Symmetry: D3
Subunit: 150 residues, 6 copies
């Protein structure tokens, strides 16, 4: 329902490059609600559990290594179709082919330095949210906005 | 001819959410000239008449009724191929399927609260403008910018 | 009360320069509510009645002449201290001495081309509002925002 | 030393109004480094303790109570002279007297709903950070940018 | 190819006249591309004609050359991975009206002859173009790849 | 004085490295000032020393000259009514920390030695400065005053 959630995270490059506010504002302006937020330096295990679906992929080692090389800003947004929309708002894997207007499109040039992570399905979203957030960090008081929802 | 015009209106949600300036600014930046502007609390006649192509359609009631639920900023922009361009700049009926960079894409989530309306043809544009503005409310002498037009 | 109103107007240069949305957005973001809005080419009388307090000043003739040389976007905003705050947000007479962050400061360089007009007291505000707006163009339904007002 | 830190929090109004990203972005742009961040619904203890210098003061009740009324985005920024700089970037207690360009100046009107809080000294900063964040929540190894610092 | 690829971009006379130079450069900077060359000049007819050589016969040519030389132009060169194709994607398509919201031509233009900016269309055209508008000395040689941008 | 006054501004190495060139130029364009000169270069020690001549003896001098020449700089000249004083107002004060929100140094800096930009401080220093960094040919001569900007 309009309660669907998604997990997003500003990777070390996004954080190091000062893009955290910019990214949060894009989702705030869109109408999505911030139900979880925190900065932390990812643990090797965290990183490996997060990207477990890519553990056989060659790039996994370097990916895990970079995701744990500095602070990360993890977050969860709520709203009608927020998982697929946040994905749209991010762009595509390769920042160079991400359309102007998306986050990777407007700001990135390297796949390994693609600024932000976004869950790709409600299934991976729920999976990833529990992975990064305990229940006491997620808001329950989500009063819908009559201005954004019919 | 660089004289084409289109009707656009910021709905109660867009107005209530403070997006009038952001929206007007997007069209100014693009090169379009505002030849009519005014805020108002639309009448049932205006609303039902404006959306007169969706009489049988269900949502018609809530639609007609929402648009009359509060302040609406109506306007007419003039420019070369402004009708089609403005809808492109708007996005698609559904805000979630609206591409990043578009008005609906950047700011909404509900097809019910999709923030703005823009004519969909020159005929509907002419019909709509005739409906929202008296002729003395529209500018007449609009000089063709040497930087925008060849 | 938090119902105090003020009159503002984007002069011909402001309009011609495509600054209308930018200006409206600055007041929308601040928390002030748009209770009246319209574009029109000022009549000589309108202009003279508006600036009647300066009718003896040398610059009056040229001022009246310019204010009637093109479209103007007239508006009224409502909120706690909106008259003095809009003034602050405009800057000072001379755009060159208006602080960065204000409207004239960020965008102007000539006194005669100082982009916008703002009422200077509640008295002149009420005076100017009736001057430019009939009662049926002013909103009465002003539901305060629990987010902006304690 | 370029190691000074300050506590800042976006209040329920700023959060509810979608200003978290805009606010974080202002400090990022300035050159300050986020060394702590998290959203939460503050406890009465936290609120009353945080505003423990305004115990006798009247508004204390509503203050303590508003801050616990909904989600608050807390954070700690580090930089050279960040405590004084951040308050400057904030404005003044009163949003109407806050200069254009400042956070309060740009976005508020009510002293009650003045959107953000920022420490007012290094002592209050240290006291406040100790209060909102556990030490494991703050970054430790913060590299001094060659472009920002000499 | 490599992270040192380069492309030639120019803010046409209309773009400079409308005050879009800073907006355009900011877009390329925010994206992570490095400015290795930059200068404002009023192009000569010979520079213009040589630059648009490929359209030497096409009918809109004369008017094009005339306009390009009718006022100041801001020329520049940006370097980064796949910058030629990326810069084009950011500009839009020939007609501003057909250009997507988010692209430069999409966000600010409405007429083909006043489409704000030019971007090289290939590494080869880019290398030729850079050569025509900049003497080697005007181009940066040292460029520390940013670790935040490139792996 | 006149609507043709001019001033010399330069995006220091830190400003260029942080990607603030477009933001800064946009600010001056939005204000109504016209760009009559512009180019990116890595200053010579002699240009730097001559430019900051007035501080030739002051202790922070050596470090200053060293930094100004440690990377690319974007130099430019803007023209408009009272542009010298206006441009300074827009930059802020020497210390970025003391600079007002809204000013360039106020919005982006935090250290005096990394204060992003330089603006001439008088018509006389501006004329001298323009002369040192730009050959006459690089400067625009024709400038149609904009009727929307000037009465
Ligand atoms: B293909 P994917 O699911 O991979 C996850 C992240 O792994 C990184 N990566 C990926 C690939 C394919 C590579 O070659 N190198 C590399 O560093 C960045 C991806 O975001 O990408 P996405 O984040 O879903 O776009
Ligand atoms: B399909 P359309 O012409 O509909 C007009 C408006 O009616 C509202 N609407 C529409 C449909 C089809 C619906 O299911 N629910 C709903 O609220 C919003 C549309 O803007 O959309 P558009 O606004 O012209 O893009
Ligand atoms: B001194 P004031 O009340 O004058 C009204 C407008 O008149 C114009 N004007 C003023 C003066 C003093 C002048 O020399 N030339 C000129 O064109 C612009 C003012 O906004 O200014 P303000 O708008 O209240 O800042
Ligand atoms: B005077 P101060 O330290 O007060 C703290 C907060 O308390 C709230 N407040 C304050 C006062 C004095 C009042 O009358 N009403 C009110 O709601 C908002 C202040 O941020 O203000 P500041 O936030 O530190 O600038
Ligand atoms: B087809 P192309 O290479 O043309 C070069 C420039 O010529 C101008 N032009 C083009 C065409 C086709 C026309 O009809 N009128 C006109 O003024 C603008 C183009 O950028 O376009 P592009 O710049 O590569 O998008
Ligand atoms: B006092 P001033 O003319 O100095 C010129 C530049 O020298 C640098 N500087 C200055 C001083 C005084 C210092 O302590 N350290 C330092 O790095 C930056 C100034 O822009 O400053 P301004 O640039 O005119 O604000
Ligand atoms: Mg994936
Ligand atoms: Mg339709
Ligand atoms: Mg006055
Ligand atoms: Mg205090
Ligand atoms: Mg081509
Ligand atoms: Mg000095």
């Amino acid at each position: 329902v309009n309660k669907e959630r998604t997990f997003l995270a500003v990777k070390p490059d996004g954080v190091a490059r000062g893009l955290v506010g910019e990214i949060i504002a894009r989702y705030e302006k869109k109408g999505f609600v911030l139900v979880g937020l925190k900065q932390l330096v990812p643990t090797k295990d965290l990183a490996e559990s997060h990207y477990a679906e890519h553990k056989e992929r060659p790039f996994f080692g370097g990916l895990v290594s970079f995701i744990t090389s500095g602070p990360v800003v993890a977050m969860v947004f709520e709203g009608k179709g927020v998982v697929a929309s946040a994905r749209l708002m991010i762009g595509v894997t390769n920042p160079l082919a991400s359309a102007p207007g998306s986050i990777r499109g407007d700001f990135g040039v390297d796949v390994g330095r693609n600024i932000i992570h976004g869950s790709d399905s409600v299934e991976s979203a729920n999976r990833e949210i529990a992975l990064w957030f305990k229940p006491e960090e997620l808001l329950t008081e989500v009063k819908p906005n009559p201005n954004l929802y019919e």
